């Protein structure tokens, strides 16, 4: 079970770490007793009115092409090793 954990649950630990990271990222600064101000402020702003961000055409296109070249190099290397 340990040994199973040495592989798979160690991976889970990392999985758990990632989940925690995202959870805390979404939290605001105020503590449990102070949330009564941040939630209220957010609701007021909504009533009044990161990862997602992406680049422009030019910038991105270079990235896509670069990734393509990387994939080609990877495949050629695999063939050479074959």
């Amino acid at each position: 079970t340990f040994q199973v954990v040495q592989g798979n649950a160690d991976m889970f630990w990392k999985f758990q770490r990632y989940h925690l990271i995202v959870e805390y990222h979404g939290r605001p600064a105020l503590a449990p007793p102070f949330i009564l101000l941040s939630h209220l402020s957010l609701v007021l702003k909504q009533v009044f009115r990161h990862l997602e961000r992406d680049l422009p055409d030019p910038v991105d296109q270079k990235i896509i092409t670069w990734e393509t070249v990387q994939k080609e190099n990877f495949l050629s290397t695999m063939e050479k090793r074959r």
Binding site: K62, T65, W66, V69
Partner: protein
């Protein structure tokens, strides 16, 4: 008359024939601020009739230019025509998008379309006689005499520490007329490399460099009848081209024919370096004359050839002249060459003095950690 076309602004210089080549080369270098070339190769074939096979495209462009992107060179590709020219041009641009390789387009001003509009400051060139490419970034607008004399000038000027500039010619399935363009080229002392499977005049040439009687009274007629048979030829025309071939084949050292489809194990850089050394053998056996080619080997990391051909025992090397190439091998951290140079006669006892060591330490790559450590300490 230098100008620029803002399409991607590309410079162009209009030059008549018989112009002093020296002035042209100097204007190029200064006004365009182009780096000194460690190699120049001149294309000799453009026939849009026959497409490029796989075995040709893959090696010729990918495997050659990907390697040449480490040392850089010049490409004397003919512009204002439809052919592999635009292929090579866009290939260099796509490779640069991911030391540089550039292409220089030279062509006669008469065959271009909309030449009066250019003659009379970006002259707008939207074209639907043959139109001109908008990929190549430079133009030398006029022509075979100019190409020959410019090759003779480049193969002579010493840009070195006094090193030469290697020149090579690449014949790719050309038309019969190029025969003349090649004939005087043998007098110009520049090694030719002929691709045996190209499919133009390169085919008949590859066939007829080796014969029992190299004289071709009528076997040349047989070959010309075999390949590209759509064009009929007069016997009076042949009786001259056969003499042209009988003269060309009288200098075996310069030209080298090679076949890629049979066994493509030898990449292009290998045969290029082999032909360059074979040609430089016949000229002279001095220590300095071998340097340029040798430097190219260091850029290709080809120890076996440099050992077999250069260090065979012909050229007597001394410890005085290996210093430059030794520093070049150290800075580029190619250790398979440092051992070879040490064994060839160089000594670390008298070469390494505190000044040389300071120069070596100055050459640390700015990105590395030791660089920042020393800079912070200073």
């Amino acid at each position: 008359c230098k100008g620029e076309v803002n399409f991607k602004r590309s410079k162009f210089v209009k030059v008549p024939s018989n112009v002093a080549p020296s002035m042209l080369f100097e204007l190029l270098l200064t006004e365009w601020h182009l780096p000194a070339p460690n190699l120049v190769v001149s294309l000799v074939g453009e026939e849009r009739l026959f497409a490029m096979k796989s075995w040709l495209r893959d090696v010729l462009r990918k495997g050659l230019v990907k390697a040449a992107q480490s040392t850089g060179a010049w490409i004397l590709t003919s512009a204002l025509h439809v052919g592999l020219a635009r292929h090579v041009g866009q290939a260099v641009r796509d490779h640069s998008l991911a030391v540089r390789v550039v292409a220089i387009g030279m062509a006669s001003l008469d065959r271009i379309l909309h030449r009066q509009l250019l003659d009379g400051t970006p002259i707008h060139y939207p074209a639907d006689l043959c139109p001109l490419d908008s990929n190549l970034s430079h133009f030398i607008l006029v022509l075979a005499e100019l190409q020959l004399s410019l090759e003779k000038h480049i193969s002579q000027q010493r840009t070195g520490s006094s090193i030469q500039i290697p020149v090579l010619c690449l014949l790719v399935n050309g038309d019969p007329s190029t025969l003349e363009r090649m004939s005087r080229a043998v007098e110009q002392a520049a090694p030719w490399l002929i691709l045996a499977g190209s499919g133009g005049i390169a085919d008949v040439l590859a066939a007829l460099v080796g014969q029992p009687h190299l004289l071709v009274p009528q076997v040349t007629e047989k070959q010309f009848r075999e390949k590209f048979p759509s064009e009929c030829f007069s016997w009076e025309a042949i009786v001259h081209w056969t003499e042209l071939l009988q003269n060309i084949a009288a200098h075996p050292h310069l030209l080298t024919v090679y076949d890629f489809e049979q066994e493509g194990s030898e990449d292009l850089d290998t045969v290029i370096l082999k032909a360059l050394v074979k040609a430089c053998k016949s000229h002279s056996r001095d220590a300095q004359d071998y340097l340029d080619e040798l430097k190219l080997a260091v850029a290709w990391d080809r120890v076996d050839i440099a050992k077999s051909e250069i260090f065979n025992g012909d050229v007597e090397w001394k410890s005085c002249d290996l210093e430059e190439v030794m520093t070049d091998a150290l800075v580029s951290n190619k250790p398979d060459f440092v051992r070879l140079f040490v064994d060839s006669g160089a000594d670390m006892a008298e070469f390494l003095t505190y000044g040389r060591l300071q120069q070596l330490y100055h050459s640390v790559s700015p990105k590395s950690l030791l660089f920042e450590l020393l800079e912070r300490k200073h």
